[PDB]
Amino acid sequence: MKQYLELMQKVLDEGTQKNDRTGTGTLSIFGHQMRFNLQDGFPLVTTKRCHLRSIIHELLWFLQGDTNIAYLHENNVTIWDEWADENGDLGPVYGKQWRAWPTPDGRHIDQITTVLNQLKNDPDSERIIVSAWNVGELDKMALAPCHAFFQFYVADGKLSCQLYQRSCDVFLGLPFNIASYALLVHMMAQQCDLEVGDFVWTGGDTHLYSNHMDQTHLQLSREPRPLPKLIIKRKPESIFDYRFEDFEIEGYDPHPGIKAPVAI
Amino acid sequence: MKQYLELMQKVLDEGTQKNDRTGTGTLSIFGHQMRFNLQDGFPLVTTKRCHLRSIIHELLWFLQGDTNIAYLHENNVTIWDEWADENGDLGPVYGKQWRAWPTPDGRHIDQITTVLNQLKNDPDSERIIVSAWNVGELDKMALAPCHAFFQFYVADGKLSCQLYQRSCDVFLGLPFNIASYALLVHMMAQQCDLEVGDFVWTGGDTHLYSNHMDQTHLQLSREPRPLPKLIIKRKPESIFDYRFEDFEIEGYDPHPGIKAPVAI
């Protein structure tokens, strides 16, 4: 996608040499923002092939407030395995905060529903926010939220959304995060009878790994293909009743996939 | 400041007509980002006169974890009065979360100190974050955090910081928020023996009030003056030992102030 390749280039161009926690070197820039008009098309990167499958399951999984990888395993989705404990437990990660942020006073707050209420009964609110940064549980999480914070905005029957992503691997993860949230907004909107607006992506520490250079050049040499079109084949009674099959992407003709090993 | 006037213009140019909670109309855009190189100079808007005084006290006040306006009153600072209850109580706002975010398990987390530790013993971290968005206490706050979330970043002995501001009044508040955080980073940095990097400002719902149009045009017609220079006249033993007098701004020659009444 144009915006993506631009980021790629910029980090190549301005990234400074930081080392990641593993010791693997990065090329990082701090602070970036990019907008995607959802009506323009579904932002799935085409300059390299990407697989929605595991993206969809994960989203559905977050929405259930599940933190164990059982559901993912049932569908043979293993992106969380690397982190899970002996029982498939990840700790109070995403799903948990989204749906049951715990209060000191004994409550479990469901921010997803809160948000839905706001969108329906107060679209003009400046606080339609969902946060996964629960300071008290950080220590129990397998990993701290990367996309830790998001806000919705309504204007002219168009729902928009800004995500704050504190840490980013431009090559491996970005693409996936973009599609994931864009998917969320489509569902959200369907459920509120609003048309999709923009998806704004904001990053903190945005980087490329030193061992992803060729693949970067390689990808940087390709030309973006037209964006595909997401189709929701059905309208559930709630945001929690979506099924893997309600989604279907049409018009996606990406260039070949590109593998990027990682260190350990 | 150049970046500021640009924002101003843009909202004039692209803001769509949203109504605020009071019913006062706004011109709003969603999602904006702007960077200020702190070495370039202290970002206090010059195209209109601004008073640091109350900005400094407030910052010092947040750092103490105080939520009552007594300290502010001692110094005749009344920007919080509009919100305070019969006793000067604001609820678990900013100061409280920064210094004593409460856990469900009975702890009070001091994110300011946590952050300082990270900056000193792990500058490469991608999670040097402070959040004031405590979902559980939102309901007890006089108002929900506007600048709800910030992240620090270290690279080449330069500390940088990104603030996520969910809601913004470009005219009245922005200027003040910019100086406030920039001040924070200077102190933070002094305390860590780092040089100041950038201050990145990210907004969600960014707006101008309909009754601030003339003043906007008025301000938009001025030409930015050179940025002043902040001077910290001393180095305390801690981030909590700063005094109102340690600060001094030099070289500030702003154009005349501009008043902007507000509705109720």
mmCIF file of C-alpha atoms in Angstrom, chain B residues 5-238:
data_model
loop_
_atom_site.group_PDB
_atom_site.id
_atom_site.type_symbol
_atom_site.label_atom_id
_atom_site.label_comp_id
_atom_site.label_asym_id
_atom_site.label_seq_id
_atom_site.Cartn_x
_atom_site.Cartn_y
_atom_site.Cartn_z
ATOM 1 C CA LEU B 5 -1.014 27.785 12.713
ATOM 2 C CA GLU B 6 -1.036 24.914 10.164
ATOM 3 C CA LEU B 7 -3.333 22.885 12.375
ATOM 4 C CA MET B 8 -5.480 25.949 12.881
ATOM 5 C CA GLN B 9 -5.808 26.402 9.135
ATOM 6 C CA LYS B 10 -6.467 22.783 8.460
ATOM 7 C CA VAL B 11 -9.344 22.586 10.858
ATOM 8 C CA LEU B 12 -10.747 25.709 9.347
ATOM 9 C CA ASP B 13 -10.280 24.019 6.024
ATOM 10 C CA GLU B 14 -11.395 20.533 6.742
ATOM 11 C CA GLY B 15 -13.186 20.568 10.035
ATOM 12 C CA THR B 16 -16.715 19.195 9.704
ATOM 13 C CA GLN B 17 -19.593 20.539 11.881
ATOM 14 C CA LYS B 18 -19.826 18.537 15.148
ATOM 15 C CA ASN B 19 -21.578 19.788 18.271
ATOM 16 C CA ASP B 20 -19.846 19.663 21.653
ATOM 17 C CA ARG B 21 -21.523 18.362 24.816
ATOM 18 C CA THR B 22 -22.555 21.868 25.893
ATOM 19 C CA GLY B 23 -24.211 22.287 22.509
ATOM 20 C CA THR B 24 -21.554 24.761 21.443
ATOM 21 C CA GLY B 25 -20.647 23.979 17.859
ATOM 22 C CA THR B 26 -17.198 22.828 16.820
ATOM 23 C CA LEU B 27 -15.178 22.472 13.659
ATOM 24 C CA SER B 28 -13.479 19.175 14.099
ATOM 25 C CA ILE B 29 -11.031 16.872 12.487
ATOM 26 C CA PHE B 30 -10.028 13.521 13.744
ATOM 27 C CA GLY B 31 -6.438 12.442 13.927
ATOM 28 C CA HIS B 32 -3.543 14.841 13.739
ATOM 29 C CA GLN B 33 0.110 14.619 14.507
ATOM 30 C CA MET B 34 2.779 17.219 14.942
ATOM 31 C CA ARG B 35 6.424 17.151 16.030
ATOM 32 C CA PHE B 36 8.516 19.744 17.831
ATOM 33 C CA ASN B 37 12.263 19.469 18.005
ATOM 34 C CA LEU B 38 12.919 20.539 21.539
ATOM 35 C CA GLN B 39 16.440 21.624 20.740
ATOM 36 C CA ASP B 40 15.003 24.013 18.151
ATOM 37 C CA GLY B 41 13.491 26.015 21.036
ATOM 38 C CA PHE B 42 10.742 25.935 23.684
ATOM 39 C CA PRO B 43 7.356 25.521 21.993
ATOM 40 C CA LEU B 44 5.380 28.306 23.636
ATOM 41 C CA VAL B 45 3.124 29.899 21.045
ATOM 42 C CA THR B 46 4.244 33.381 20.163
ATOM 43 C CA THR B 47 1.528 34.399 17.711
ATOM 44 C CA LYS B 48 -0.458 35.215 20.851
ATOM 45 C CA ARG B 49 0.672 35.786 24.390
ATOM 46 C CA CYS B 50 0.553 32.842 26.785
ATOM 47 C CA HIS B 51 1.221 32.594 30.536
ATOM 48 C CA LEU B 52 3.409 29.818 31.799
ATOM 49 C CA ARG B 53 2.752 30.573 35.455
ATOM 50 C CA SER B 54 -0.363 28.481 35.875
ATOM 51 C CA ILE B 55 1.107 25.883 33.528
ATOM 52 C CA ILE B 56 4.112 25.369 35.836
ATOM 53 C CA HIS B 57 2.102 25.141 39.034
ATOM 54 C CA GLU B 58 -0.263 22.641 37.527
ATOM 55 C CA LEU B 59 2.611 20.423 36.417
ATOM 56 C CA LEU B 60 4.267 20.587 39.816
ATOM 57 C CA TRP B 61 0.792 19.799 41.257
ATOM 58 C CA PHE B 62 0.305 16.681 39.072
ATOM 59 C CA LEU B 63 3.709 15.463 40.121
ATOM 60 C CA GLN B 64 2.707 15.527 43.738
ATOM 61 C CA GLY B 65 -0.215 13.202 43.074
ATOM 62 C CA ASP B 66 -2.521 15.858 44.462
ATOM 63 C CA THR B 67 -6.162 16.012 43.321
ATOM 64 C CA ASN B 68 -7.389 18.831 45.541
ATOM 65 C CA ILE B 69 -6.979 22.420 44.387
ATOM 66 C CA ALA B 70 -5.537 23.746 47.663
ATOM 67 C CA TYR B 71 -1.968 23.932 46.350
ATOM 68 C CA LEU B 72 -3.192 25.720 43.263
ATOM 69 C CA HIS B 73 -5.107 28.204 45.354
ATOM 70 C CA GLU B 74 -2.099 28.965 47.532
ATOM 71 C CA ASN B 75 -0.507 30.302 44.350
ATOM 72 C CA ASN B 76 -3.660 31.871 43.075
ATOM 73 C CA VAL B 77 -4.066 29.432 40.178
ATOM 74 C CA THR B 78 -7.771 28.947 39.358
ATOM 75 C CA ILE B 79 -7.893 26.900 36.188
ATOM 76 C CA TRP B 80 -9.316 23.923 38.076
ATOM 77 C CA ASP B 81 -11.929 25.744 40.025
ATOM 78 C CA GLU B 82 -14.583 25.364 37.391
ATOM 79 C CA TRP B 83 -14.448 21.637 38.042
ATOM 80 C CA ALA B 84 -13.803 21.228 41.735
ATOM 81 C CA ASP B 85 -16.362 20.119 44.270
ATOM 82 C CA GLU B 86 -17.389 21.921 47.438
ATOM 83 C CA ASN B 87 -14.036 20.936 49.030
ATOM 84 C CA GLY B 88 -11.565 21.483 46.157
ATOM 85 C CA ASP B 89 -11.727 17.829 45.277
ATOM 86 C CA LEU B 90 -11.445 16.855 41.680
ATOM 87 C CA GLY B 91 -11.590 13.066 41.946
ATOM 88 C CA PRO B 92 -8.852 10.623 40.966
ATOM 89 C CA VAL B 93 -7.645 12.778 38.107
ATOM 90 C CA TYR B 94 -4.203 13.063 36.477
ATOM 91 C CA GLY B 95 -2.040 13.515 39.545
ATOM 92 C CA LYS B 96 -3.627 10.474 41.153
ATOM 93 C CA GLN B 97 -3.095 8.066 38.275
ATOM 94 C CA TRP B 98 0.377 9.303 37.526
ATOM 95 C CA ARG B 99 1.525 8.652 41.048
ATOM 96 C CA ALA B 100 -0.858 6.184 42.573
ATOM 97 C CA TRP B 101 -2.741 4.260 39.986
ATOM 98 C CA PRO B 102 -4.706 1.872 42.146
ATOM 99 C CA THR B 103 -4.709 -1.881 41.564
ATOM 100 C CA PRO B 104 -7.512 -4.303 42.287
ATOM 101 C CA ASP B 105 -5.101 -6.058 44.596
ATOM 102 C CA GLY B 106 -4.509 -3.108 46.903
ATOM 103 C CA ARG B 107 -1.451 -1.407 45.441
ATOM 104 C CA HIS B 108 -0.756 2.147 44.274
ATOM 105 C CA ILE B 109 1.405 2.317 41.301
ATOM 106 C CA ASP B 110 3.632 5.277 40.776
ATOM 107 C CA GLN B 111 4.099 5.442 37.028
ATOM 108 C CA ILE B 112 6.265 8.517 37.220
ATOM 109 C CA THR B 113 8.918 6.714 39.176
ATOM 110 C CA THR B 114 8.541 3.551 37.159
ATOM 111 C CA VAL B 115 9.268 5.621 34.108
ATOM 112 C CA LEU B 116 12.329 7.203 35.682
ATOM 113 C CA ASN B 117 13.676 3.805 36.501
ATOM 114 C CA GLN B 118 13.207 2.695 32.924
ATOM 115 C CA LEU B 119 14.874 5.730 31.507
ATOM 116 C CA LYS B 120 17.898 5.072 33.720
ATOM 117 C CA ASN B 121 18.171 1.339 33.528
ATOM 118 C CA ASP B 122 16.620 0.475 30.181
ATOM 119 C CA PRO B 123 16.331 3.399 27.775
ATOM 120 C CA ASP B 124 15.747 1.049 24.899
ATOM 121 C CA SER B 125 12.387 -0.103 26.265
ATOM 122 C CA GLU B 126 9.335 0.162 24.049
ATOM 123 C CA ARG B 127 7.017 0.403 27.003
ATOM 124 C CA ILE B 128 8.096 3.541 28.822
ATOM 125 C CA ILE B 129 4.529 4.620 29.117
ATOM 126 C CA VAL B 130 2.349 6.629 31.500
ATOM 127 C CA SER B 131 -1.424 6.291 31.250
ATOM 128 C CA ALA B 132 -4.093 8.309 32.986
ATOM 129 C CA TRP B 133 -6.899 6.402 31.410
ATOM 130 C CA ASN B 134 -7.892 4.308 34.413
ATOM 131 C CA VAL B 135 -11.126 2.754 33.190
ATOM 132 C CA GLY B 136 -12.249 1.887 36.729
ATOM 133 C CA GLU B 137 -12.084 5.439 38.102
ATOM 134 C CA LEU B 138 -13.373 7.309 35.106
ATOM 135 C CA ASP B 139 -16.681 7.612 36.775
ATOM 136 C CA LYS B 140 -15.210 9.321 39.864
ATOM 137 C CA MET B 141 -13.207 11.930 37.957
ATOM 138 C CA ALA B 142 -14.450 15.526 37.619
ATOM 139 C CA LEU B 143 -13.580 15.044 33.991
ATOM 140 C CA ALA B 144 -11.951 12.249 31.982
ATOM 141 C CA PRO B 145 -8.329 12.777 30.972
ATOM 142 C CA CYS B 146 -7.886 14.793 27.766
ATOM 143 C CA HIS B 147 -4.121 14.099 27.507
ATOM 144 C CA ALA B 148 -4.629 10.535 28.620
ATOM 145 C CA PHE B 149 -1.590 8.836 27.529
ATOM 146 C CA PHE B 150 2.119 9.322 26.952
ATOM 147 C CA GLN B 151 5.213 7.432 25.920
ATOM 148 C CA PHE B 152 8.911 8.238 26.196
ATOM 149 C CA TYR B 153 11.621 7.150 23.795
ATOM 150 C CA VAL B 154 15.387 7.284 24.021
ATOM 151 C CA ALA B 155 17.782 7.331 21.145
ATOM 152 C CA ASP B 156 21.218 8.967 20.884
ATOM 153 C CA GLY B 157 21.014 10.389 24.450
ATOM 154 C CA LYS B 158 17.931 12.198 23.363
ATOM 155 C CA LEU B 159 14.739 11.724 25.230
ATOM 156 C CA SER B 160 11.584 12.144 23.136
ATOM 157 C CA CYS B 161 7.927 11.891 24.014
ATOM 158 C CA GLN B 162 4.608 11.275 22.327
ATOM 159 C CA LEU B 163 1.352 12.388 23.889
ATOM 160 C CA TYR B 164 -2.005 11.098 22.846
ATOM 161 C CA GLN B 165 -4.668 13.716 23.351
ATOM 162 C CA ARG B 166 -8.157 12.319 22.680
ATOM 163 C CA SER B 167 -9.921 15.675 22.638
ATOM 164 C CA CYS B 168 -8.702 19.126 21.710
ATOM 165 C CA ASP B 169 -9.727 22.801 21.703
ATOM 166 C CA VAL B 170 -7.116 24.139 19.348
ATOM 167 C CA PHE B 171 -7.533 27.747 20.377
ATOM 168 C CA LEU B 172 -7.777 27.685 24.181
ATOM 169 C CA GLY B 173 -6.034 24.525 25.333
ATOM 170 C CA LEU B 174 -3.578 23.161 22.758
ATOM 171 C CA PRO B 175 -0.896 25.822 23.363
ATOM 172 C CA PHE B 176 -1.021 25.163 27.034
ATOM 173 C CA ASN B 177 -0.793 21.399 26.659
ATOM 174 C CA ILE B 178 2.172 21.649 24.387
ATOM 175 C CA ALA B 179 4.204 23.758 26.826
ATOM 176 C CA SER B 180 3.169 21.613 29.711
ATOM 177 C CA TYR B 181 4.482 18.361 28.316
ATOM 178 C CA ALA B 182 7.553 19.961 26.857
ATOM 179 C CA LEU B 183 8.282 21.192 30.303
ATOM 180 C CA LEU B 184 7.894 17.645 31.622
ATOM 181 C CA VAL B 185 10.375 16.255 29.189
ATOM 182 C CA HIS B 186 12.983 18.854 30.071
ATOM 183 C CA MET B 187 12.760 17.894 33.769
ATOM 184 C CA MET B 188 12.618 14.198 32.974
ATOM 185 C CA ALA B 189 15.747 14.573 30.819
ATOM 186 C CA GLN B 190 17.644 16.662 33.258
ATOM 187 C CA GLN B 191 17.026 13.943 35.747
ATOM 188 C CA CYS B 192 18.335 11.227 33.398
ATOM 189 C CA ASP B 193 21.305 13.023 31.869
ATOM 190 C CA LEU B 194 19.854 12.991 28.462
ATOM 191 C CA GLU B 195 19.410 15.738 26.002
ATOM 192 C CA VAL B 196 15.938 16.637 24.831
ATOM 193 C CA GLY B 197 14.691 15.095 21.666
ATOM 194 C CA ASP B 198 11.298 15.669 20.101
ATOM 195 C CA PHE B 199 7.871 16.165 21.509
ATOM 196 C CA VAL B 200 5.274 14.530 19.378
ATOM 197 C CA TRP B 201 1.679 15.588 19.787
ATOM 198 C CA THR B 202 -1.129 13.324 18.604
ATOM 199 C CA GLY B 203 -4.765 14.320 18.737
ATOM 200 C CA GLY B 204 -8.068 12.531 18.290
ATOM 201 C CA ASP B 205 -11.059 14.887 18.082
ATOM 202 C CA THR B 206 -9.271 18.176 17.260
ATOM 203 C CA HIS B 207 -11.444 21.195 17.102
ATOM 204 C CA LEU B 208 -12.177 24.911 17.003
ATOM 205 C CA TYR B 209 -15.291 26.383 18.602
ATOM 206 C CA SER B 210 -17.684 28.298 16.346
ATOM 207 C CA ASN B 211 -17.370 31.321 18.622
ATOM 208 C CA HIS B 212 -13.635 31.440 18.146
ATOM 209 C CA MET B 213 -13.628 32.242 14.486
ATOM 210 C CA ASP B 214 -12.555 35.882 14.486
ATOM 211 C CA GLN B 215 -9.862 35.229 17.008
ATOM 212 C CA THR B 216 -8.689 32.409 14.767
ATOM 213 C CA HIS B 217 -8.515 34.610 11.685
ATOM 214 C CA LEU B 218 -7.046 37.216 13.857
ATOM 215 C CA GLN B 219 -4.332 34.852 15.072
ATOM 216 C CA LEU B 220 -3.894 33.252 11.661
ATOM 217 C CA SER B 221 -2.859 36.664 10.363
ATOM 218 C CA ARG B 222 0.149 36.938 12.645
ATOM 219 C CA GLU B 223 3.685 35.834 12.041
ATOM 220 C CA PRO B 224 5.381 33.527 14.430
ATOM 221 C CA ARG B 225 8.247 34.899 16.412
ATOM 222 C CA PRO B 226 11.366 33.045 17.362
ATOM 223 C CA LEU B 227 10.932 30.453 20.018
ATOM 224 C CA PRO B 228 12.035 31.319 23.520
ATOM 225 C CA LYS B 229 14.490 29.236 25.526
ATOM 226 C CA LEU B 230 13.691 27.390 28.728
ATOM 227 C CA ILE B 231 16.133 27.505 31.506
ATOM 228 C CA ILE B 232 16.229 25.308 34.510
ATOM 229 C CA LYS B 233 18.154 27.253 37.131
ATOM 230 C CA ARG B 234 18.859 24.224 39.261
ATOM 231 C CA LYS B 235 18.971 20.430 39.492
ATOM 232 C CA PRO B 236 16.874 18.899 42.299
ATOM 233 C CA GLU B 237 17.544 15.520 43.878
ATOM 234 C CA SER B 238 14.388 14.217 42.246
#
